[PDB]
Design a protein around this ligand. Structure first.
Ligand SMILES: [Mg+2]
Ligand SMILES: [Mg+2]
Ligand SMILES: [Mg+2]
Ligand SMILES: [Mg+2]
Ligand SMILES: [Zn+2]
Ligand SMILES: [Zn+2]
Ligand SMILES: [Zn+2]
Ligand SMILES: [Zn+2]
Lengths: 201, 208, 201, 208, 201, 208, 201, 208
């Protein structure tokens, strides 16, 4: 593998987590903890003073992050600011997994020029992760402009007909551009996990 | 009013529509018949000798199409070639309601360069009808690029979780703050009926 | 355009907003801020003493509103009192955009006479915005009685089978009257944005 | 009891229904057969020589229709011409259950003046069956204007997000505080079966 | 009519309500207020000392209730205790409307004998209102055993696949017994309104 | 194991199933083929001369049906006559898996007296399969009256918001605390496969 | 029967429950109370000092549990830790009903080896209850490896496309392995009730 | 780019596709036509004499299939025999896009021993396409056992609450943290188009 150790922090207590983390005391490899509330990192910090917490991403990393495993980069593209929390979970997961990451945020198609202003960056990625909720159409527009794997992530932030990400999920599954592959809602971690594999062939 | 008479032919038979058309033929000039299957017209055709069937729109008109009443036009914009049937329903009722139509077909977002190629023609419309299935992304992109009212039609073409146009409809509905407004799945007639009202919002009395 | 500047206040902090508003210090044009909680206008008011807050609408306007751009008016029609908050977001958005607005409230069809009591007002509008949740049927009844563009807005206020506006959305999409066009749920802003364009041809 | 015998013919064959009808023909006077396709009756028809097929209702009766048992009537009110098949199912079972029916067809809300034209006849019913598809607005409007019990039937006619009558059903269900009550999609028989109970809630013994 | 005056208390304030109630100071007829929280009747009571509040039903009645308008009775049938609040809204609405009411509670089919133990009461009603959520099947069982109008009311009290009354709604719409008519979820008022009309032919 | 071999014939052709049956005919005694349309068997029939088609169950067996392995029986209980096809699928696979079956058809709840008439036979089963569409009330009623395991099958027969068995399925699922357990819509085979395991939970070695 | 007395504690007050429990003062048989909050057992304990409360299961048992009625055992299989509360309701219900129970937890297929590490235990049960939410696929995998009745229980613990157990319900109904039978969501009690009957033939 | 040209033939006629193919035949080497019904090819076939129809994939190629561009392979893994049509769509477009494919059909989880039998071949792929209907459990099991990217395709084969692939799709989507990624129902072409990009991430210039 070489895959860092991943702790799903949703169902675990701060004590239970320190118990898993320090039980991995023998690893030169980093440890990622995803879906970790700020109130729970508050609890953890005295036990793990060498840990790093990423507010938006709700991710914690313990350990020395070594250099990127590979030169190419993953691009993480978002439609709007409401998408930032789950995009950040994809960026931190990908970086902890050893990938260089280029963050291309707020390029939703209501101001499509912003998407073109940053298009050379998207086109130079080995993998593109597209993240959207309201403007789920962005996956299809990105997918029509790039010749690399695109992994779409629907998010649950939206209004009434967003159906808490469900519309966004169906929109990405139904993209008229080919080459788009989809993960379940809010699952930025899952997208980065796959993108990391694809990137490090 | 000034509107043509409209017959919804999906539920009705050939015999039944000949009745309506011959009862309305007393006046009113143009008569628009929507959702008329190729087979129903074939059975109509000898009874109504002046009717024109617009095959791919699945529409039938009797009476001659008017000269455009306003100087603008309506842009009918299309994502793919399979959006053409409800696009032609929209464009044929728009023309029958007295509007000039400009067709911008097959500029979906898998080759968005094609949409920029025609963006001069779209911005120059008074109203824009955008027709798309699958993701329905085309409406969002158009809505953000033009400052004219846009009316989005989701089509039922697709596969799998296409859910017969639902994905398209819901996606277009989530772009309304861009100046977009939406009708029901495959409802090209409805779209054109509204665009026509918008597009139509005189002739000098003393000539030689 | 001539369109006033619009700030979506849902995802932004009171400080972030003052930052956008005062960064538009060079505009003779008004600035509309939609979806702004009363607790957030509480925060804003010392910074923007010249601002106006509309309670029902959750809209804030900074700037000198100049005269209507055009003589005709938009009619905003509602089924019941539960519809007032999102109807008010349509009325304030339309007025800030430069349209004269005639408010025709509480004319749901359980007392259809109220709808006829105010029918000359609806018929004289250039555009009609119809707003309903329970009595979503009102869009179709209005659409059958007027010869102008009607933009229907479903709202999320209702009981069990209202499906939080979803029934109302399907009802308006399926109107048997022609000439009705629909926006997503609760999106009074969007309706006024379009109605404003239509009005000012 | 006093009710006619009822055969639901949708799932059954021609051969199978001849069996039931000849087994029930021993007594019971009128026999109502619902959802009988035009083709099934054509195959029935020679075996049951007294059966009458009501084509557009897709119903079959054997035995003569009774004289109305109560003096009121049931109003069957319809939004559009394509609501006529489940309207005729409602009206033919109502008449077969011994009720006088008054048909008020094609008064949907796109021309609501037509509904006011007949409002005298609707208020004068004892029960009102309202039949509509698409929005189903007609039931709300009727429910608010009459103070008799109303039973609303959603029909499955429509297009797109019509969802085969769901939009109609849900819309009618959201008007029940107006004195409206609802049955399943296309269930004209169910509606008339209840209206008939409501409408039927004597003959002097000493005559010359 | 003779129908008492009905106030939907959901969207109105305690002050707004006293304003409607006392504006009906000239009526020998009662006034029903439905969907009224106990905290809101707490507010009302000093203004309306002659009012009556029904806890389960969330209904308030002001006025002298005169004798039943008619001899026959409405039967209100429930599947279980979770149905009691909305059944009580049907019973109080029917009684205020002038109907005698016979309450037949907790006869769900998991103990069908209870339903037979009270069957003569159900069979003697002019109208039966059936109320269920989990055991929505009860409408069909009752409808198969009685020869009078049955109005079914689905309720939102249930577990995961109850879909907050939606299953119960579809179950009653699809009863294999004929003669069942359905109202929207939780709408005990609506059922009694119709049942009252049917009862008083 | 001791189970017969099972071929799901819905997706497969006639040619394809002859292949499977002749490849499995080497041993295994009885072969159960489910969802075999009347037309597919007609095309099979000359190639497999010992196969018996159970028309209304839409099942095909080759090999002779065993003598019941356990002394109890399985009760297959049915709400209406149109539940008979998935009832016969359940009853024919149960009998092919070596169980005695007792059929209690057409005791739905619109005439619940019929269910009490046969309640002696239902209580006396070891397992009970209950098959119903529409409301699916029958499963609840049965679940509350018997203290044997009950397996409920929703059927897809119905109209309107029947939603092709969903209403039935959801209704049965909301009665599980009564000792009821549920399978997928129309899945009579699945039900009987489980009932058979439950029903089958020896022969003296020294006879004359 | 011999079935212990079961109290559904969801809709009942702590006082109402003591009222039912002590009204069963004449029983050599145990009494199970399911769906009982810890705050409600807090209330009960002074009245019923001989009661036992199971935290995860939210079950209370009063009475002397006698020996298992039968030698074979029910196996209770879970996909992950989020499934433990409703699996525990199945285990406690089955044990109170007189069945021996073998708890096989955390064997979801993302680490399928754990499922094989405990496969002899699953194969030796007379009945298997499978409990899953996210990894609802586990029912089908278990059902393909065992020759005994399998009763699947979907749970509501999950992420966006879990639809609060609904996906898990459809997944179990649609298992490609035969011999799987399904209960409604979260209904661990119901599964054990049936499993108990099947076990004690 | 280097990709073959792709024609989506579901919505198009025979006449219409001959047009596209003869207009694209000027260059581009291989032309992949998806969702081409057996009847449409029969009508195409005389006009395009070099076209090969892959019946069970419902695909048509013109031009010869390339030699694999990369040395790895793509594993196409299948739960059941009825997953074979969208598996063959995936495998035929993968091979047409220049990839070596290894087919691991009919290893669904009702006999999971079959999947372990071939696990050597699956781990040895560079990408894995997993195709399943009904529960769709196969994708989860595969996702947890391999450390290569997996692309899961839900198929619409099933019965009842299969909901035409929804159960499969939703189940696969709930296993993405295992390194799984998903496409739309029956979208074998989409899956192979992505797998092909992943699998394809030189030839020495100086030979004798
Ligand atoms: Mg715009
Ligand atoms: Mg009324
Ligand atoms: Mg039982
Ligand atoms: Mg993996
Ligand atoms: Zn598109
Ligand atoms: Zn209508
Ligand atoms: Zn039934
Ligand atoms: Zn499978």
């Amino acid at each position: 593998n070489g895959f860092p150790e991943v702790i799903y922090g949703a169902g675990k207590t701060a004590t239970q987590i320190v118990g898993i983390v320090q039980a991995l005391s023998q690893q030169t490899l980093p440890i990622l903890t995803t879906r970790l509330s700020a109130e729970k990192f508050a609890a953890l910090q005295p036990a793990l003073p060498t840990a790093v917490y990423h507010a938006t991403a709700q991710c914690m990393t313990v350990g020395e992050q070594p250099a990127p495993k590979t030169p190419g980069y993953i691009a993480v593209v978002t439609a709007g600011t409401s998408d930032q929390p789950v995009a950040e979970e994809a960026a931190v997961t990908a970086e902890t997994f050893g990938n260089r990451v280029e963050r291309v945020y707020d390029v939703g198609v209501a101001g499509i020029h912003r998407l073109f202003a940053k298009l050379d960056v998207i086109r130079g990625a080995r993998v593109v992760i597209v993240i959207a909720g309201m403007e789920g159409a962005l996956a299809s527009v990105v997918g029509g402009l790039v010749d690399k794997p695109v992994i779409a992530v629907p998010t649950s932030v939206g209004y009434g007909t967003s159906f808490q990400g469900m519309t966004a999920l169906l929109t990405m599954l139904n993209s008229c551009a080919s080459g788009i592959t989809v993960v379940n809602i809010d699952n930025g971690f899952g997208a980065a996990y796959s993108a990391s594999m694809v990137n490090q062939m």
